[PDB]
């Protein structure tokens, strides 16, 4: 609660690059980082892929 997230958003605004945040803490599985194998019934790629998608940018802020 010190402004770290706020200043991250401010940095993205100043640089014009996209800002996206996510909480890895207390997370064990790596699938969401790397999605799934695409063969399991109903699989998506990793959350980083979802960010790359919704951002429409190559150099966003992560």
């Amino acid at each position: 609660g010190v402004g770290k997230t706020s200043i991250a958003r401010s940095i993205a605004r100043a640089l014009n690059r996209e800002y996206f945040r996510f909480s890895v803490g207390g997370m064990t599985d790596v699938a969401e980082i790397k999605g799934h194998r695409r063969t399991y019934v109903g699989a998506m790629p990793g959350k980083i892929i979802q960010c790359l998608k919704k951002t429409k940018t190559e150099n966003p802020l992560i």
Partner: protein, 62 residues
């Protein structure tokens, strides 16, 4: 309304708390999209209530 928020198992292949966090994010909620549906939907005008018998076993981030 959400009940037994404190009782969430948050076990294998689960971790719905993140979604709940994503559900309860003041800003991300406004662009919520599903796995079934990818379009983002506003959630800033919808009121949320949670109920539990204890304030502790509930996730700290939540």
């Amino acid at each position: 309304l959400i009940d037994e928020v404190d009782k969430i198992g948050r076990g294998y292949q689960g971790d719905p708390s993140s979604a709940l966090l994503e559900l309860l994010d003041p800003e991300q909620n406004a662009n919520f999209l599903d796995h079934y549906l990818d379009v983002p939907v506003d959630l800033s005008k919808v009121l949320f209530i949670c109920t539990a018998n204890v304030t502790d076993t509930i996730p700290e981030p939540l």
